[PDB]
């Protein structure tokens, strides 16, 4: 009848554990419990299911144990990865009642952040390939504990940080982009609104 | 096993809309949910019976028809602005767990006049990053599009790449003040300096836009802003 999940966004750094709470309220005794994962733009896909109290279920390093006594079905993982960033739905389904239908919780979005071993913050300027007058400022190589914030100017656009992985080099990096048309737009002036590190490299050139 | 159609729709306030679901796997149950941030997945209509329907938690503003065992369809007579959400179709065997479709992004707007495809541009990596870290980041920018129905991809030397790529999860409003503001999306492709230095290497930024359909009326001067692809190219420099 009622499924209650953790509210909002859960931010965890790669390698660390996670706990996504799910509590319910059901009149029924023979009930099936589920976790569905939804990766960006894809269909929700089953991850775990169980109908038996106190039994633990494991799948992709994701465990969940039914606790009927406290109406709990939490989702856990000991060492989270970047591919784990998704929306997770907790669901309930009473067996043997005629009309089969799920009871979903609102969902919990998990965002996983990179562990940057060797940072070196920098703000470079990139130029357009066709007709080279347009420009973009690239803020890159900062640690995950650095948070980018949007500009106080309505002519300036700043995107949030985003990690990229070069599989060949086993190397990962955080990047954020800034662009504006106005003549009053400098790369040194682009990320003032954000808590940028003291050692942020700014080329002259 | 479960297919949704259309994959995307831009409809008008008042217009007739029809979303179709076709199950290739035989199941007695079929449902239509809408996904909303905060609300999650909510049921609109379901069918236990191969040739009739039953009302879910929010049937208001909707009609649904199951004329086959394999086909469940969603119908809106007066498309309201409220009806814009991602729609999900699921089929299940009663004992069985659901199988889901990929979903349809439906957008009900006032004026199809607000619809615009994106402008894509590739920005060459900085010599400063090329010296300092021996790596080269290419930026792609897709600007001035409405709605935010875009898929961005990178193509190195004719093949799709995923490694050393990162795209914004959600686009960003160009004029956050306005209700029907256009969007912008960025992407980054990071290569080794060698790879960019080589003038014989070709980089392409592909943007699939979802807009108007063939049947949509366009009584405007500019080109009809239909579903389309928009690209921007780059070759290395030494």
XYZ file of C-alpha atoms in Angstrom:
443
model
C 0.000 0.000 0.000
C 2.827 2.461 0.878
C 6.569 2.421 -0.057
C 8.961 5.067 1.439
C 12.543 5.612 0.068
C 15.367 8.015 1.022
C 14.707 11.577 -0.184
C 16.705 13.342 -2.834
C 20.261 12.675 -3.908
C 22.913 10.403 -2.405
C 26.471 11.452 -3.310
C 29.194 8.890 -2.564
C 32.830 8.696 -3.732
C 33.988 5.563 -5.664
C 35.221 2.706 -3.457
C 33.043 3.726 -0.476
C 29.797 2.007 0.764
C 26.155 3.145 0.182
C 22.711 2.635 1.900
C 19.443 3.368 0.141
C 16.576 3.011 2.592
C 13.205 1.471 1.763
C 10.379 1.011 4.302
C 6.872 -0.048 3.466
C 3.378 -0.557 4.809
C 1.313 -3.471 3.474
C -1.903 -5.210 4.645
C -0.847 -8.430 2.830
C 1.315 -11.379 4.029
C 2.472 -13.100 0.826
C 4.347 -10.124 -0.774
C 7.254 -9.793 -3.312
C 9.867 -7.003 -2.829
C 11.992 -5.448 -5.520
C 14.791 -3.068 -6.483
C 14.836 -1.706 -10.067
C 17.620 0.386 -11.426
C 17.186 3.018 -14.126
C 20.350 4.141 -15.939
C 20.012 7.552 -17.762
C 17.511 7.338 -20.727
C 17.128 3.526 -20.383
C 14.208 1.394 -19.132
C 13.984 0.469 -15.410
C 15.611 -2.999 -15.090
C 15.255 -5.487 -12.164
C 18.301 -5.656 -9.862
C 17.107 -7.753 -6.850
C 13.904 -9.509 -5.680
C 12.954 -11.624 -2.635
C 9.755 -12.739 -0.934
C 11.380 -14.479 2.074
C 11.989 -12.753 5.365
C 15.553 -12.417 6.624
C 17.158 -13.912 3.480
C 19.957 -11.822 1.858
C 20.104 -11.341 -1.974
C 23.200 -10.329 -3.897
C 23.633 -9.291 -7.480
C 26.210 -6.871 -8.722
C 27.791 -6.262 -5.387
C 24.368 -4.951 -4.319
C 22.770 -6.683 -1.374
C 19.337 -6.342 0.234
C 17.823 -8.355 3.144
C 14.047 -8.365 3.857
C 13.211 -7.393 7.503
C 9.389 -7.861 7.751
C 9.494 -7.122 11.482
C 10.623 -3.468 10.778
C 9.142 -3.249 7.259
C 12.651 -2.731 5.798
C 14.205 -3.592 2.403
C 17.307 -1.363 2.130
C 19.716 -1.443 -0.822
C 23.441 -1.664 0.051
C 26.848 -1.972 -1.639
C 30.309 -2.169 0.073
C 32.378 -0.480 -2.685
C 30.443 1.704 -5.161
C 31.601 2.445 -8.799
C 30.969 5.292 -11.301
C 28.663 3.032 -13.367
C 26.397 2.831 -10.292
C 25.059 6.419 -10.874
C 21.339 5.776 -11.493
C 17.824 6.187 -10.183
C 16.829 3.265 -7.913
C 13.199 2.263 -7.383
C 12.047 0.209 -4.450
C 8.888 -1.822 -5.125
C 6.280 -4.085 -3.403
C 3.815 -6.628 -4.883
C 1.150 -8.649 -2.997
C 0.960 -12.216 -4.409
C -2.375 -14.119 -4.661
C -4.890 -11.220 -4.659
C -6.192 -11.424 -8.224
C -5.040 -8.150 -9.836
C -1.221 -8.026 -9.766
C 0.262 -4.427 -9.549
C 3.386 -2.876 -8.000
C 3.569 -0.209 -5.307
C 6.675 1.944 -6.024
C 8.568 4.390 -3.821
C 9.438 7.846 -5.251
C 12.962 6.667 -6.127
C 16.449 7.639 -4.990
C 19.069 9.015 -7.316
C 22.612 7.870 -6.499
C 25.410 9.985 -7.912
C 28.920 8.395 -7.630
C 32.012 10.689 -7.672
C 35.583 9.994 -8.804
C 38.543 9.606 -6.512
C 41.178 11.904 -8.090
C 44.604 10.721 -6.866
C 46.750 13.306 -8.759
C 44.889 16.643 -9.253
C 46.243 19.810 -10.961
C 43.426 22.428 -11.356
C 43.497 24.628 -14.514
C 41.342 26.990 -16.651
C 42.255 26.846 -20.341
C 40.591 28.682 -23.257
C 39.379 26.621 -26.264
C 38.643 28.090 -29.725
C 36.121 27.119 -32.339
C 37.122 25.072 -35.264
C 35.113 26.874 -37.897
C 35.370 30.559 -37.854
C 37.422 30.989 -34.840
C 36.036 33.886 -32.844
C 33.875 31.972 -30.388
C 35.439 30.673 -27.134
C 34.841 28.287 -24.187
C 36.817 28.113 -20.896
C 37.749 24.639 -19.725
C 38.071 24.160 -15.960
C 39.625 20.703 -15.462
C 41.817 18.340 -13.308
C 40.354 19.384 -9.938
C 39.562 16.924 -7.058
C 35.962 15.705 -6.529
C 35.739 17.816 -3.313
C 35.576 20.953 -5.556
C 32.088 22.209 -6.365
C 31.318 24.333 -9.455
C 28.543 26.935 -9.199
C 26.570 28.870 -11.851
C 27.409 32.524 -12.688
C 25.857 35.706 -11.200
C 25.720 36.935 -14.883
C 22.707 36.005 -17.158
C 24.981 36.174 -20.275
C 27.328 33.520 -18.762
C 26.716 29.759 -18.884
C 28.500 27.302 -16.551
C 27.890 23.478 -16.662
C 28.409 21.242 -13.604
C 31.482 18.986 -13.134
C 31.536 15.651 -15.011
C 34.168 12.891 -14.840
C 35.589 11.231 -17.957
C 37.629 8.030 -18.120
C 40.534 7.208 -20.428
C 40.569 3.438 -20.201
C 44.036 3.181 -21.945
C 45.701 5.455 -19.318
C 43.552 4.184 -16.333
C 43.216 8.021 -15.861
C 39.984 9.894 -14.823
C 39.296 13.670 -14.768
C 36.661 16.220 -13.667
C 35.709 18.903 -16.150
C 33.339 21.914 -16.186
C 32.666 24.267 -19.114
C 32.011 27.992 -19.301
C 30.950 30.111 -22.273
C 29.624 33.653 -23.019
C 29.214 35.964 -26.039
C 29.781 39.362 -24.237
C 33.133 41.232 -24.551
C 33.289 41.426 -20.700
C 34.031 37.593 -20.551
C 37.550 36.481 -19.405
C 38.674 32.952 -18.460
C 40.297 34.257 -15.231
C 36.860 35.859 -14.403
C 34.784 32.707 -15.379
C 34.883 30.644 -12.171
C 35.058 33.372 -9.426
C 31.479 32.432 -8.255
C 32.805 28.886 -7.433
C 35.197 27.759 -4.642
C 38.204 27.108 -6.937
C 41.590 25.970 -5.449
C 44.453 28.422 -4.659
C 46.770 26.459 -7.035
C 44.493 26.872 -10.153
C 46.751 27.220 -13.236
C 45.851 30.167 -15.513
C 47.944 30.332 -18.754
C 49.051 33.832 -19.950
C 50.110 32.634 -22.730
C 10.307 -8.102 -25.842
C 8.529 -4.752 -25.196
C 8.519 -1.804 -27.686
C 7.202 1.775 -27.292
C 6.110 4.127 -30.078
C 6.735 7.018 -30.710
C 10.125 7.280 -28.913
C 9.397 11.090 -28.667
C 6.477 13.486 -29.348
C 5.978 17.218 -29.329
C 2.223 17.822 -29.125
C 0.073 20.949 -28.803
C -2.272 22.163 -26.088
C -5.566 20.649 -27.183
C -4.242 18.109 -29.730
C -5.052 14.363 -29.994
C -2.153 12.036 -28.871
C -1.617 8.252 -29.170
C 1.210 6.222 -27.543
C 1.456 2.573 -28.558
C 2.947 -0.463 -26.861
C 3.685 -3.757 -28.546
C 4.710 -6.817 -26.504
C 6.681 -9.514 -28.449
C 6.506 -11.688 -25.251
C 3.023 -13.020 -24.329
C 1.696 -11.589 -21.005
C -1.805 -11.060 -19.577
C -0.981 -7.749 -17.858
C 0.010 -4.459 -19.503
C 0.388 -1.040 -17.811
C 1.081 2.589 -18.632
C 2.956 4.650 -16.097
C 4.182 8.216 -16.202
C 7.489 9.104 -14.566
C 7.748 12.466 -12.678
C 10.598 13.915 -10.554
C 9.362 13.678 -6.935
C 6.267 11.556 -7.783
C 8.313 8.690 -9.338
C 6.361 6.069 -11.358
C 2.520 6.398 -11.098
C -0.108 4.212 -12.818
C -2.566 5.821 -15.303
C -4.380 2.676 -16.735
C -3.905 -1.101 -16.823
C -5.439 -4.193 -18.449
C -5.940 -7.655 -16.918
C -8.188 -8.568 -19.940
C -6.829 -8.882 -23.561
C -9.740 -6.657 -24.910
C -10.612 -4.150 -22.054
C -9.069 -1.713 -19.499
C -9.006 -0.686 -15.773
C -8.215 2.754 -14.192
C -4.974 3.313 -12.206
C -4.139 5.952 -9.575
C -4.457 8.920 -12.046
C -6.812 8.140 -15.012
C -7.866 11.859 -15.223
C -7.049 13.388 -18.616
C -6.382 9.888 -20.101
C -8.121 7.075 -22.026
C -6.518 3.691 -22.794
C -7.391 0.910 -25.201
C -6.252 -2.703 -25.293
C -7.713 -4.054 -28.601
C -5.239 -7.036 -28.619
C -3.344 -9.117 -26.178
C -0.087 -7.769 -27.586
C -1.174 -4.071 -28.029
C -1.930 -1.592 -25.185
C -2.364 2.027 -26.209
C -2.593 5.390 -24.412
C -4.923 8.134 -25.754
C -5.246 11.854 -24.905
C -8.119 13.773 -26.587
C -7.209 17.251 -25.187
C -3.412 17.233 -24.639
C -2.907 19.388 -21.544
C 0.315 21.130 -20.560
C 0.175 18.820 -17.398
C 0.545 15.731 -19.611
C 4.230 16.399 -20.403
C 6.270 13.574 -18.762
C 8.127 10.394 -19.744
C 5.704 7.539 -20.305
C 6.616 3.946 -19.556
C 4.972 0.822 -20.739
C 5.310 -2.479 -18.866
C 3.911 -5.855 -19.369
C 3.840 -8.630 -16.840
C 2.789 -12.180 -16.306
C 0.784 -12.166 -13.044
C 3.240 -14.303 -11.195
C 5.996 -12.587 -13.160
C 8.097 -9.475 -12.780
C 7.678 -6.628 -15.120
C 9.490 -6.086 -18.341
C 9.705 -2.437 -19.365
C 9.809 -0.463 -22.594
C 12.504 2.244 -23.154
C 9.868 5.017 -22.757
C 8.477 7.960 -24.686
C 9.239 11.592 -23.855
C 6.027 13.453 -24.535
C 6.026 17.296 -24.651
C 2.801 19.287 -24.749
C 3.430 22.942 -25.554
C 1.458 26.115 -26.454
C 3.304 27.090 -29.700
C 5.233 24.642 -32.000
C 6.813 28.027 -32.939
C 9.074 27.542 -29.841
C 10.603 24.401 -31.530
C 14.178 24.725 -32.776
C 16.890 22.206 -33.701
C 20.380 22.722 -32.132
C 23.468 24.568 -33.366
C 26.494 22.318 -32.858
C 30.124 23.563 -32.617
C 33.468 21.830 -31.905
C 36.118 23.765 -29.911
C 39.775 22.775 -30.494
C 41.957 21.781 -27.490
C 44.259 24.392 -25.913
C 48.080 24.344 -26.573
C 48.423 25.176 -22.811
C 46.773 21.832 -21.850
C 48.757 20.220 -24.710
C 52.057 21.307 -23.086
C 51.100 21.111 -19.332
C 49.426 17.640 -19.282
C 50.206 16.122 -22.762
C 46.363 15.661 -23.188
C 43.834 17.363 -25.471
C 40.153 18.096 -24.611
C 37.659 18.782 -27.415
C 34.410 20.508 -26.424
C 31.139 20.142 -28.234
C 28.349 22.673 -27.668
C 24.738 22.196 -28.829
C 22.860 25.506 -28.322
C 19.415 27.055 -28.989
C 17.308 23.902 -29.008
C 13.758 23.401 -27.763
C 12.744 20.936 -26.317
C 15.725 19.360 -24.422
C 15.087 16.090 -26.409
C 18.740 15.484 -27.597
C 21.228 12.537 -27.765
C 24.906 13.523 -28.178
C 27.712 11.166 -29.478
C 31.412 11.431 -30.496
C 32.812 9.768 -33.635
C 36.575 9.341 -34.028
C 37.714 8.363 -37.547
C 34.181 7.048 -38.384
C 33.731 4.904 -35.277
C 31.748 5.803 -32.116
C 33.928 6.361 -29.071
C 32.970 6.234 -25.371
C 36.377 6.280 -23.610
C 37.662 9.700 -22.550
C 34.127 11.163 -23.121
C 31.759 12.867 -20.704
C 28.470 14.654 -21.562
C 26.265 16.792 -19.252
C 23.565 14.524 -17.632
C 20.830 17.120 -18.236
C 20.966 20.206 -20.535
C 20.895 23.809 -19.186
C 18.478 26.741 -19.881
C 19.908 29.557 -21.976
C 17.440 32.129 -20.473
C 16.432 30.615 -17.081
C 13.989 33.549 -16.645
C 11.590 32.386 -19.462
C 9.197 29.398 -19.185
C 9.730 28.306 -22.820
C 13.538 29.034 -22.870
C 15.922 27.195 -25.280
C 18.673 24.777 -24.049
C 22.353 24.166 -24.268
C 24.390 20.993 -23.794
C 28.127 20.435 -23.619
C 30.370 17.425 -24.098
C 34.055 16.756 -23.584
C 36.341 14.355 -25.513
C 39.846 13.951 -24.089
C 42.659 12.498 -26.274
C 46.495 12.238 -25.884
C 48.384 15.261 -27.397
C 49.878 12.942 -30.085
C 46.316 12.023 -31.320
C 45.245 15.661 -31.680
C 48.674 16.816 -33.089
C 48.216 14.343 -36.009
C 46.366 16.376 -38.725
C 45.108 13.051 -40.316
C 42.659 12.328 -37.390
C 38.878 13.233 -37.797
C 36.549 14.083 -34.855
C 32.785 14.472 -35.211
C 30.136 15.560 -32.664
C 26.720 14.070 -33.473
C 23.452 15.452 -32.028
C 20.201 13.653 -32.582
C 17.325 16.119 -32.043
C 13.694 15.063 -31.589
C 11.178 17.587 -32.721
C 8.189 17.840 -35.033
C 6.856 14.912 -37.080
C 6.052 14.720 -40.855
C 2.285 15.270 -40.141
C 2.838 18.476 -38.104
C 1.638 21.746 -39.640
C 4.290 24.347 -40.382
C 3.136 27.751 -41.630
C 6.429 29.549 -40.922
C 9.242 31.031 -43.051
C 12.175 29.087 -41.449
C 12.751 25.312 -42.067
C 10.374 22.870 -40.264
C 12.153 21.868 -36.994
C 11.659 18.106 -37.488
C 13.509 15.206 -35.813
C 17.019 15.369 -37.247
C 20.814 15.044 -36.725
C 23.144 18.087 -36.499
C 26.967 17.692 -36.619
C 30.285 19.577 -36.290
C 33.699 18.282 -37.479
C 37.396 18.600 -36.521
C 40.837 17.391 -37.767
C 44.048 17.660 -35.779
C 46.556 20.567 -35.916
C 50.325 20.657 -35.135
